[model samples]
Target chain A: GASQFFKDNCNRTTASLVEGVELTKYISDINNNTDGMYVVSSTGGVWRISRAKDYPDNVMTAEMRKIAMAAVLAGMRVNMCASPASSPNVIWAIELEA
Target chain B: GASQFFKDNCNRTTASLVEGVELTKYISDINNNTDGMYVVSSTGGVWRISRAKDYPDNVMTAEMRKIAMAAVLAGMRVNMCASPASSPNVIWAIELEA
Candidate 1:
């Protein structure tokens, strides 16, 4: 599982990749996959922002879903960031803006 | 802030934009910005995977960080997905493989 992955990685610094983007269709753990979350964007780009559920520093499942729903319902612009070595480009944080 | 954006766009379907990609330097909430997360790629393509903290479908903060750390240390490959309409792009899933 991801246990080994997290045990090894999760200590590197990350940089901002996308800034002020709009999101749509916020789905938490699509199909019951705890490894990450699913999202739809305003630019017609469908994305799966990575978040290892089994990791130590990950957000709470309920809290994570709360934020995603808020953004989706409110139509907020978001900022995305990532680490240089992460595969599938997992998002470690999500910020919503006006 | 992003209420209007998500309200207008959260219903769209997402598609897989970037498939299996390796990740490094996973940082969660760089500078404590909750809008999204930052990442660095093996190909030197730095990214910010978005996850709305205030939204309904998002991973927990601690958990998110935990995953980031794992990926950074282990150097695992991940599968990313995104929606077409989203700006700056956002990831919804992070599947790690050996």
Candidate 2:
């Protein structure tokens, strides 16, 4: 599957690492047979993104837009995390592949 | 995350495997883990779905749109099960990964 991820104005803070670790363990409990995961969190105001697989962190920063766009084109929904309370917070959009 | 889970007109009609069990266990505390989880719910008029690493069960149905739309995708601001009144629901145009 295409790797599509996005986070806006999330904190890449130390707390995020703690959050990631905790989240990892939680998902593990749910899918004990799964190997790894991709996690996204908000730090203060920025989002710190991570994955269980050894994907280059640079991919998230340098190639996120392009890679994610590719996934959208492949018929996937991109979970764009938004903040403003008025906003839906999670906006799901996709490009229909012909 | 590209499985891009979505729920509408749902109603696997199974008490949602104990209201939020799938959501809580999979997304568990929002930070500790990962496994297999794509859950949504809406009941009274209609709303319910489930997933737990089982691909066939992951897809949402047309019957659940009633609850998923008006309740879950309504973009709730907190725990959807806390009051059985808040959560991410969807109607005809349901979304998740995007």
- Using lDDT, give the best candidate's number: 1
lDDT of 1 by residue, B51-95 (tens): 544423344333334444455666655544444555544554343
How many residue pairs clash per model? 125, 47
Per-candidate TM equals 0.37, 0.21
Report the C-alpha lDDT of model 2 over B1-98, residue by residue, as the tens digit.
21212222223322121222111101111112211112322221222232222344323432222233223233331122121332323122233322
Q: For candidate 2, give the DockQ.
A: 0.02
lDDT of 2 by residue, A12-90 (tens): 2112111121111111124564432233222222222233232222222222233233333333222333223421122
Cα RMSDs, all models:
18.0, 15.5
Q: Please give, for residues A1-98, the per-residue lDDT of candidate 1 as tens digits.
A: 22333323433444435665666544333323234554656664444455434545444434554555556556666665544454335566555555
- lDDT of each model, Cα atoms only? 0.48, 0.23
Off by over 4 Å in 2: A1-44, A53-98, B1-50, B60-98
The two-chain DockQ for each candidate, comma-separated, is: 0.05, 0.02
Reference-based lDDT, residue A80, model 1: 53
